[PDB]
Amino acid sequence: SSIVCDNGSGMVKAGFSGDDAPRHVFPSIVGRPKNMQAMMGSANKTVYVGDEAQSKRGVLSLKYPIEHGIVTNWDDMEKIWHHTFYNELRVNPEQHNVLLTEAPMNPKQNREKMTQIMFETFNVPSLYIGIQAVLSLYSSGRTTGIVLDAGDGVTHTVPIYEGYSLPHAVRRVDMAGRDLTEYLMKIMMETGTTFTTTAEKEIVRNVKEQLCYVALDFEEEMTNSAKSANEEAFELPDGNVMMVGNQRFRCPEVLFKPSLIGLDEAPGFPEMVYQSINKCDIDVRRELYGNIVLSGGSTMFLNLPERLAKEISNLAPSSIKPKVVAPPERKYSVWIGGSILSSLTTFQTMWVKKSEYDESGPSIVHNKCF
Amino acid sequence: SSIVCDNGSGMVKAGFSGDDAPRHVFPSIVGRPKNMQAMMGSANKTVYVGDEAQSKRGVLSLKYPIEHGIVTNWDDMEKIWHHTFYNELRVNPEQHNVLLTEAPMNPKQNREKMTQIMFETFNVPSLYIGIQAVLSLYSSGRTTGIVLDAGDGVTHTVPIYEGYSLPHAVRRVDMAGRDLTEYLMKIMMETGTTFTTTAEKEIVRNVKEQLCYVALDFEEEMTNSAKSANEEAFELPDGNVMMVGNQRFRCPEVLFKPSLIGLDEAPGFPEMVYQSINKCDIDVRRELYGNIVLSGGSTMFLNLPERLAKEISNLAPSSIKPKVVAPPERKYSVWIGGSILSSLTTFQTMWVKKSEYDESGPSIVHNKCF
Amino acid sequence: SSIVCDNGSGMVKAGFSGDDAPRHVFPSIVGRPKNMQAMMGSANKTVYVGDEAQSKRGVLSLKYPIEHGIVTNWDDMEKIWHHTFYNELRVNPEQHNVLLTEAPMNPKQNREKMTQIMFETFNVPSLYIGIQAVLSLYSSGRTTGIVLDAGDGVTHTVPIYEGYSLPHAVRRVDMAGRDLTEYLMKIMMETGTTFTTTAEKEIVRNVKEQLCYVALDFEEEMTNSAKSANEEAFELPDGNVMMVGNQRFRCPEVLFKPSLIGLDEAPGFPEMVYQSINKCDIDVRRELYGNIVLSGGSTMFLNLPERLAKEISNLAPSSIKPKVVAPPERKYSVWIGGSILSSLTTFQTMWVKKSEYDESGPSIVHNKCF
Amino acid sequence: SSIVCDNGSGMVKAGFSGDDAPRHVFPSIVGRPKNMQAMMGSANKTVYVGDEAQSKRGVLSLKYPIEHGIVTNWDDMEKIWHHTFYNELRVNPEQHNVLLTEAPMNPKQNREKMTQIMFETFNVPSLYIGIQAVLSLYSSGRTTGIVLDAGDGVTHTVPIYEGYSLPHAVRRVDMAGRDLTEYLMKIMMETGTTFTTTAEKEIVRNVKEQLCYVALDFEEEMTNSAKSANEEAFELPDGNVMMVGNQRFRCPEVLFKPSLIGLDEAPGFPEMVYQSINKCDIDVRRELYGNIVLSGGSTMFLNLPERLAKEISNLAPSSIKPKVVAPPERKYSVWIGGSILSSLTTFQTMWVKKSEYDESGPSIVHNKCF
Amino acid sequence: SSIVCDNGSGMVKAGFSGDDAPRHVFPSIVGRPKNMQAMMGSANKTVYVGDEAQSKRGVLSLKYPIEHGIVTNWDDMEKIWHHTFYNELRVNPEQHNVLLTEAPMNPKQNREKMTQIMFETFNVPSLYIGIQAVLSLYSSGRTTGIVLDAGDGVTHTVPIYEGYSLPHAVRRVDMAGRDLTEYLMKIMMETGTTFTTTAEKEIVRNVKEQLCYVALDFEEEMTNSAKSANEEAFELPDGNVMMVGNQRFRCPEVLFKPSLIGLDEAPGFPEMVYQSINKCDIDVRRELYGNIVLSGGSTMFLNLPERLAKEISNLAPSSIKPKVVAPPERKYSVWIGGSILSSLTTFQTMWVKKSEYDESGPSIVHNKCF
Ligand SMILES: Nc1ncnc2c1ncn2[C@@H]1O[C@H](COP(=O)(O)OP(=O)(O)O)[C@@H](O)[C@H]1O
Ligand SMILES: Nc1ncnc2c1ncn2[C@@H]1O[C@H](COP(=O)(O)OP(=O)(O)O)[C@@H](O)[C@H]1O
Ligand SMILES: Nc1ncnc2c1ncn2[C@@H]1O[C@H](COP(=O)(O)OP(=O)(O)O)[C@@H](O)[C@H]1O
Ligand SMILES: Nc1ncnc2c1ncn2[C@@H]1O[C@H](COP(=O)(O)OP(=O)(O)O)[C@@H](O)[C@H]1O
Ligand SMILES: Nc1ncnc2c1ncn2[C@@H]1O[C@H](COP(=O)(O)OP(=O)(O)O)[C@@H](O)[C@H]1O
Ligand SMILES: [Mg+2]
Ligand SMILES: [Mg+2]
Ligand SMILES: [Mg+2]
Ligand SMILES: [Mg+2]
Ligand SMILES: [Mg+2]
């Protein structure tokens, strides 16, 4: 059976082809102890991976090997893959095909080192690497539309018409949920709460995923909270209680005005879609407006699909009725689409075999995997 | 049953003998994709013909095999004929007679290659090729008059008296509707609209067929629009709106003064008829002035028959009253006349049989088909 | 004395008639601060123009008022002209004649608004507007030849024979150096360097003007760099070093195959000249092939004149020997030719006086300036 | 005359505008007796403020109202301000303007309560609050550079270019001289000396300011002292003598490696400057490296400017020559700059008047004081 | 077999590894006669050690070599060790390994002189020194929790999580049972009983260990005894009877408010635990609250565990349920844990051999014994 591994900046999702959902989802982190061992009977390790690092984070310093979709530490990246094959799936990687994913317009060296490790360290028989936004269209059962994908490190838009690519309209911003966590941690200091460690950053991420929401009218929302000053209580791991005010809707507002974090010229979600559509062709634009697909975990805020539709309607001409499609399970769209694609009988010739890599070299991955 | 196929520069019209109208009319284009396939489940082809190419033109580059009445790509010309027999009429071409049309004073190689393909590739039993302007007289039920035919690539005039040809008075200009589309696309840039692709050229052709008209007095019309500056709105496929000013009546004015597009010595519609009549005989001219017949799609502009009659009256002597006949269905005159001619019992000996071609060779078509 | 101002998409060149070179050349940009003032003693402005904006670009957002030869912001366009008259030339514009330039086939509204501002805001006595490619022929001292002009926004070709214009052979593409900067910035991401701001775009423009060159044989050049992988180092303003590989010759290759940036049907430099010549007359073509003149800053790449000559020779018939003339100072050909033309004694009747504008109105500029 | 009051965690500095130095500097402490009065003729108080508390500290328990730049006891904070106006300056606070200082990224409630006390309790006519690091640039007579300020509770870095703020590059650590005193008191127990009371903590602070110095090479310095074991004698208030060994250079080493006190992820002085510079813009970094300004009492250790310059040079690229500016009087830079700023004639409109506070409320301080 | 010797300020506990309890427990005192010998046949010594000194204390002056965990007389310290090896265990110290204990944050010279005596005077083969609070966790069979140890001279708290040390949260007060004996001896004078000699101080220590208890509500307990005035009788060695009133619960109240003996700023038992927990990490505090371990002889008062739990619950947040673990045999926890640790097979490499001391010197003990 073939293995589908959706590895992004934040999470790892692994499973087998043909299933409807991944069976193993864990954070993509590596932890190391920062103090000396005091007892003698402990079964402590020297490096912690995955959920082990998350649970013992009180005594560890945490690192993410991938930043903005690019691997910055290959030694720690092999530890995560070694964890996935032997501890999560519990298989022998020499007997399965592996399908991987990547963001568009990445440096070529990132794709070449990934292939070298898979063939030489793990001895995989055959390999394939896909583009994340294309795999999201497979899960929706359509061949026309524009996909907005926002995860932990990158946001990109890819338009497709009748199954044909439009390479000159692809956009990428490099600003996603991890930058939202840092902004929330900073504006939280206005109320007297300060977090600085990597372990405390994981607490801030939980506050974002439970209390933050998109305001339908931002300017009115600020005025109302200035007078009412309604607040909500959050319970910290140590038992204390933290109050959250207007930080709840100011944090996701970055996705609509990136100048709050210094990106004074980055477009933002409505303009990113609008500019990408107007670069395709005049005879294609009406169909693209009718199928706008949301994907990724950073699109899971409450009221985000409704706010996005209203903003685009103010940019498009009067006769255009934009339609935004937001599946309830869009956090796993990339993995689901990859499971569908690898099950097709016509795909069996698209695998990159080990024998071809032995002759052509690492550069063969660029010729194939289109 | 016999097949009538009126194939010009722009359109294909096909049907069966005895009918009052063709049953299949589609543009004569071939489309090819200009980008790479991105999905795997699509039923995409590699070449598109006819209305398929028109609908998917946003991702295709379009070509016309015929230019100025002469085939410039025989491989793409066979694709169009193959489309007509098997997808439109859905017949076996080995059991029907085929009647084709051609413009006068064409190169001899054009007619010879057409015969070779029909007999050897499609194995047609018998064949015939006619002159387009002569077939227009059949549909009017007359044997005397001069025909002005203007389609997409060629304009020609042919006079006939009592059923006798007058070979030394035939004229041909090679300037028709496709040159009108290019002129409209150029003078449209004076108002800030630029179209450059082949797909965008199809949009300009729709603007010509809906908003352009012939001005009865050109010089007065320009003066009035200089002050009023009245404009009309046209809605583009993507939802935007384009304003059209005096380009509405300047575009068809080319047919009356070809020096606007650089043909400083070509006559134009009134002079083309006038010069053709004065080359026939003094005892024939009065009858020719009384029956001037319009044919083709480029004669469908509003006010064109009225403007033409006035201009000729300024050239003819005072005792002559020219009369212009413009049937409301003159876009299909050539096809209708060919349907009538092929139904006559005296025509059954005029077919060129396959056996004769086997002996004489391709040159037999010149001896017959007179 | 008369003033010559060559204002294109990228640069402003100003001076006085009779001189051999302009005395003031600065970029055509306007800058505005994007953060709040923190100190109190600074002499900061609110808008920066010219070289002031270039030097302080670290804290400013930059805009070009002119895009593709058409003014898109008239308020910022007046600031640039106000800067030129009072800060660069330091004259009173009510005592001098002004000669301006424009690209062919521009919208009529662009020329009318330019005249209204000059007469009403600056109170210029007399005015004239010329065509850039014609002024380049004056600087070469010839009356026959075809001019290829490529600046920052537009590329056009204009043929002239014995001093007579050939209006139906003029071509224009709207693709020039600014599109080359954007393509270099995109293919630079394949090596792990990302620039997104307007200020960072000025750094990419300096890399193009120092390291990029035209490859004589493109296909062989790619193969050699695939094995040798020779690279060159460029020093960034902050002290870091960037390596440039085969991006050096891939960037100017767009001028020879515009399908790399999506213009799948635009001709390119050799085909643009070839198509323009074959539209003139059969008795003029041999003289045009003998005088092909290069003008503009986008023609300054190394090996460009040699590559252009070879490509044209493969399109022309065997008995034709094309000759390309590339002056070493062709970046200032338009300004130099305008200085010559305004010094002629026969030109003194060609000025458009203010009194005529008072009666006829802004439309007088179309009747004159031919 | 206007009053300038620089109130930090450790000291109070007060004076009048226009002077070159403050006239009153005293510690910011409040003392209360811990035993019962035994005699009857004493003029003892119940609360001691300032130098009175310092002298009688043998029978008092001492508290600091401000911790890490944030007021933790407002009742004791009013006693310190009441002491400053009536006992030190000896003025009526209803006739002078007051200028105050604050650290960046402080909680908003801290600034609001400060304004309420000044207007309602002391009836000040007009008020203003500034940022400490900005006022340090005024005293140096420059508008470009990055300021490192380290006092008793907070360390922060603020970059400024051409008088423009760069809000997204400000950093703050909350670790300063008071944490250095606690670390020295702990490692002093390795030699058999134990101090536990608040009064004994003032003795340890005097040892830090007289015997501690920065080692140019820390690892070599430890090795040399392991063999030589050279020591220095310090005389205690009671007449006994304490010997100090390698604690002299280990105490200020915390500023270069904060993991010695448990802040395993805080950067430290060289990394704090390096990270702040690399967040500004590529076109600004070279000027920032050339002007690095030291401010505050915790930068007064011997050899600190020389060690800082060497460490930064190992982080910057090879073509960069960092320059550190350390004025001999940098302990009073914030007060001096505030005296200069309040003397400017353009500043007279920046005062926040009492009438405005009556209408807008305490929130007016956020709109102004930028 | 290995020897375990738990030597604190008050008692000596010695035994062999593997046993469940020490076999020899005697006070750590040295006695000398204060009068002249009168008879001739007596077998009197000149120095008495251990239980010999306790029995003949009527004619001796007693001294403790160790005060606050630090040896103040090394000559008398060797007499106690010589007594333990030859009179109590009756072994040859050249054939056994010795494990010793020490309080945290002791002067380094104390540990170095101890090693020098063991290796050079007694010629021990191998040696090891541990931290007392860590050894108490071994006896409980846990790797997480915070230990409160209070003996005769020192009180300290040490938190441990998952076997990892937290060095920056260790606290030490230097106030234990010997200070409780002196306070009881002073407040006993309010009822007319005066003890001044060292021998009489041993009688007061017996009164503390039999009649003193912790009051659950101190303020109510004082009020009840003011009216009832209930008293208890104690029989002195000479036959007289002493009455004890409210001194029974006032003596152990010092452990909860150290200001009764002049330590006005020392925290006390509930605050010592509370401050130590809040210095560890937010993700560790909940587990520490659930395992609070009592150790040492000064925790043996009646009702002490119940009073401690109630006081901590008033300091912790509402969702926290503190749990105090008080083993019935906690007076020997340090010795028992050391017996367990020295029996582990993984510990056999942790011994400090004599050969290593010969080369490295006395400083080797700091590198090991972590
Ligand atoms: N319900 C939610 N609301 C807002 N953000 C979320 C939610 N769930 C997950 N996220 C954010 O999505 C990011 C990761 O998204 P995902 O696409 O699943 O991972 P990856 O970036 O690895 O592809 C994380 O930064 C996380 O904070
Ligand atoms: N209503 C109309 N008004 C003006 N032009 C028309 C109209 N309808 C068709 N045309 C033009 O007629 C041309 C084709 O005419 P037709 O004779 O039918 O085809 P063909 O040239 O193949 O014989 C096209 O260029 C089209 O733009
Ligand atoms: N040496 C060079 N090599 C390549 N390109 C150049 C060179 N010098 C200038 N350019 C380009 O020429 C463009 C401007 O050319 P120019 O004709 O002088 O200005 P304008 O477009 O305003 O007329 C700019 O985009 C610049 O990048
Ligand atoms: N010569 C010195 N060497 C080292 N530290 C010093 C020296 N002088 C003062 N300090 C320290 O500076 C701190 C206060 O600095 P300062 O900035 O003047 O006060 P504040 O923190 O109130 O602004 C005190 O902790 C003091 O110990
Ligand atoms: N039952 C008891 N109640 C109160 N205090 C006790 C009790 N038993 C012993 N102590 C006190 O404990 C102290 C010694 O405790 P321990 O920890 O055994 O010795 P060390 O201090 O040498 O480690 C002595 O001061 C003694 O008075
Ligand atoms: Mg993802
Ligand atoms: Mg026709
Ligand atoms: Mg130019
Ligand atoms: Mg300060
Ligand atoms: Mg003990």
Numbering used by the authors:
A (entry chain A), B (entry chain E), C (entry chain D), D (entry chain C), E (entry chain B): 6 to 375
List sentences from the manuscript.
We show that, despite > 1 billion years of evolution, pathogenic Leishmania major parasite and mammalian actins share the same overall fold and co-polymerize with each other. By applying single-filament biochemistry we discovered that, compared to mammalian proteins, Leishmania actin filaments depolymerize more rapidly from both ends, and are severed > 100-fold more efficiently by cofilin. Overall, these structures of Leishmania actin demonstrate that the helical nature of actin is remarkably conserved from divergent unicellular parasites to mammals.
To uncover the molecular basis of rapid LmActin filament depolymerization, we determined the structures of ADP- and ADP-Pi-states of LmActin by cryogenic electron microscopy (cryo-EM) in the absence of any actin-stabilizing agents at average resolutions of 2.7 and 3.3 Å, respectively. The conformational state of Leishmania ADP-actin subunits within filaments is also very similar (RMSD 0.785 Å) to that of muscle actin, but with small variations in the D-loop position and in the position of subdomain 4 at the pointed end. Furthermore, insertion of Asp269 to the H-plug introduces an additional buried negative charge to the core of the filament that is not compensated by any additional charge pair from the neighboring subunits. At the pointed end tip of subdomain 4, we observed an interesting shift of the β-strand 237–242 towards the center of the filament when compared to muscle actin. The Arg196Thr substitution also breaks the electrostatic interaction with Glu236. Of particular interest are the three methionines in Leishmania actin, two of which (Met44 and Met45) are inserted deep into the barbed end cleft of the adjacent longitudinal subunit. We speculate that Met44 and Met45 could form more stable interactions with the adjacent subunit in comparison to vertebrate actins, and could thus compensate for weaker lateral subunit interactions within the filament. Interestingly, LmActin exhibited the lowest free energy (−17.4 kcal/mol) when compared to chicken actin (−22.0 kcal/mol), jasplakinolide-stabilized PfActin (−21.2 kcal/mol) or phalloidin-stabilized rabbit actin (−24.3 kcal/mol).
